[PDB]
Structure formats: C-alpha cells, structure tokens
Design a protein around this ligand. Structure first.
Ligand SMILES: NC(=O)c1ccc[n+]([C@@H]2O[C@H](COP(=O)([O-])OP(=O)(O)OC[C@H]3O[C@@H](n4cnc5c(N)ncnc54)[C@H](OP(=O)(O)O)[C@@H]3O)[C@@H](O)[C@H]2O)c1
Ligand SMILES: CCc1nc(N)nc(N)c1C#C[C@@H](C)c1cc2c(c(-c3ccc(CC(=O)O)cc3)c1)OCO2
Length: 157
C-alpha cells in the first residue's frame, strides 16, 4: 500500500522558504495518527525542513547524496527503491517527490487548507474524475486551529 500524505492550500501551495506556510496543530495530529507505525518517504529537502526523524515510524529519505547518513533515517537513492519498502508507505513530500509519484500511488490523504498563502512549492494538479472521494471531513476550528481545513481520502479510480 502506497499513499500520498500532504497538506495543501486552495492553490495547492505546500511550502514557502523550506517551511509550512501555516500553523495547524490538528493536521500534525492527523499525520501522527495516519503514519505512526508505518513508513514515511520524503525528499532530502523535506527532511532537512523537519530537522530530525519523526518518532515511532520508519523515516526514509531519498537523496542522490551517497554521504547522507542520519541516526534514525533509512536512505534510498532511487525512486525504484520505494517499491521495495514493506508495510504501508506514505509519500510525505515534497514537490519533487509528489510530482514523481502522484501517478504511482494507490491513494492520497490530503488536508485541504481553505486559504490562499504565499508559496514557492506546490502539489501537482489533479482532477477528481481520476479520484473517488472515500471520505471528506471538515476540520474543527478552535483557538489553536483557526484556518478552515478539510481531510480528504482520495482513492484512484
Ligand atoms: N504541505 C505539505 O504536506 C508538505 C509536506 C512535505 C514537504 N513540504 C514542503 O515542500 C518543500 C520542499 O519540496 P522540494 O520540491 O523543494 O524538495 P523535496 O521533494 O522534498 O526534495 C528534493 C530532493 O529529493 C531528492 N530526490 C528527489 N527525487 C530523487 C530521485 N529520483 N533520486 C534520488 N534523489 C531524489 C534530491 O535530493 P539530492 O539533491 O540530495 O540528491 C532532491 O534534491 C518545502 O517547502 C516543504 O515545506 C510540504
Ligand atoms: C504536518 C504537515 C503535513 N501535513 C500533511 N497532511 N502532510 C504532510 N506531509 C505534512 C508535512 C510535512 C513536513 C514539511 C513537516 C514539516 C514540519 C513538521 C512536520 C510535522 C511535525 C510533527 C508531526 C506530528 C508527528 O507525526 O509526530 C507531523 C508533522 C512535518 O514540523 C516541523 O516542520
């Protein structure tokens, strides 16, 4: 099972200057629930933006750097290596990896941020006539979660 896992805004912005443009704690909880116990695969720049591996799951980093080596991180050097990872594998980002994999994944867990942010990195365009809506759940707004957002589970038709 190969899935995308992404938060993107109304124009599909996912990042600005190596950071998330927005602060949404509920989306962090969403990611932890989905991916604890499984595998995250991310590009090198996504990994550097996080700083360190995320706990209690396998962290796989794709890079051409043969010197890359981080305690708690498994390194792969080819897209093809992804297809040798067991278990449930989530493509975690960023733009380059999403572009490489959106045509390969079985399904996508998208958090749509219902806002328009300045970005320099984007999720690729997709059309809902390629993807069925398995579920769509509005995120709950409160003091610490103040941007409207929707959790989609899209499965390839
Ligand atoms: N909103 C979200 O859900 C979310 C999630 C993740 C990331 N992001 C954002 O996305 C942005 C970063 O995305 P990005 O496109 O700049 O970078 P990226 O996709 O994270 O990383 C690109 C790097 O990955 C490696 N790579 C990609 N394909 C490869 C291949 N086929 N073989 C070997 N290595 C490969 C290369 O590393 P080397 O150059 O070292 O060889 C390349 O430089 C950040 O702003 C981050 O905040 C957002
Ligand atoms: C949470 C944002 C997000 N949402 C969805 N829908 N899909 C994604 N791919 C990402 C992403 C991402 C990368 C860019 C990133 C950058 C960061 C982060 C975290 C992050 C930190 C803690 C958790 C909670 C956990 O799992 O323990 C989850 C994500 C993740 O924090 C520093 O900057």
């Amino acid at each position: 099972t190969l899935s995308i896992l992404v938060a993107h805004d109304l124009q599909r912005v996912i990042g600005f200057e190596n950071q998330l443009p927005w602060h949404l704690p509920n989306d962090l909880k969403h990611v932890k629930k989905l991916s604890t116990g499984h595998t995250l695969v991310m590009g090198r720049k996504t990994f550097e933006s996080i700083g360190k591996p995320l706990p209690n799951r396998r962290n796989v980093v794709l890079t051409s750097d043969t010197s890359f080596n981080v305690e708690g991180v498994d390194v792969i050097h080819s897209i093809e290596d992804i297809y040798q990872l067991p278990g449930h594998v989530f493509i975690f980002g960023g733009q380059t990896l999403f572009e490489e994999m959106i045509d390969k994944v079985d399904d996508m867990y998208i958090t749509v941020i219902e806002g328009k942010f300045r970005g320099d990195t984007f999720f690729p365009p997709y059309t809902f006539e390629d993807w069925e809506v398995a579920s769509s759940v509005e995120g709950k707004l409160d003091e610490k979660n103040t941007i409207p957002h929707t959790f989609l589970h899209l499965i390839r038709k």
